[PDB]
Amino acid sequence: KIIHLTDDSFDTDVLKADGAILVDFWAEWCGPCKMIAPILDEIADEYQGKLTVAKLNIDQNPGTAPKYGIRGIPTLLLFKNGEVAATKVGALSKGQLKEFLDANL
Template sequence: MATFNDIIQKNPLVLIDFSASWCGPCQQLSPILDEVKKHFGDDLSVIKIDVDKNQKLAAYYRVQGVPTMMLFKSGNQVWRQSGLLMKSELIKVINQHQK
């Protein structure tokens, strides 16, 4: 299994979703992320990370609330936001960093 760093380094654009199974907004976000992934296809990797199962990683990135999303471009964090976003808002953010 690839490590977190391998994933963000090897894929040009990676959207990370720090979430939790007990989180209502996280559950609402899940189908939105599926739609965003379909929109971008192979140009975007979407990775869900359960903060309860990956506490060290969540602490490293100072995730204080869920959902927290981060966008990595070529291994560098270029965007971060906590809370629920709609599909159109996420697509707009990703488009800004795609080139």
């Protein structure tokens, strides 16, 4: 269900697309990233329609991460029509991410 993002279309897909978009910055050799991936998949299936979610491998879209102040992974950016509505870093727990989204939505 999660959409997979690319550098070339990021502007339109994330900035022009309507609604809030939660983008997770990703890599495969990363530990905590694999800790939190299941949670992101969960949130994808719980909040359908109320929120849209995307994943971006830094190892395949290296240009995007610098542009948005990101210096380490995992990182979560909640965007709303061209601006990041919310920002968070580090492997949150299930509850933490849940109330984070609850508050931000």
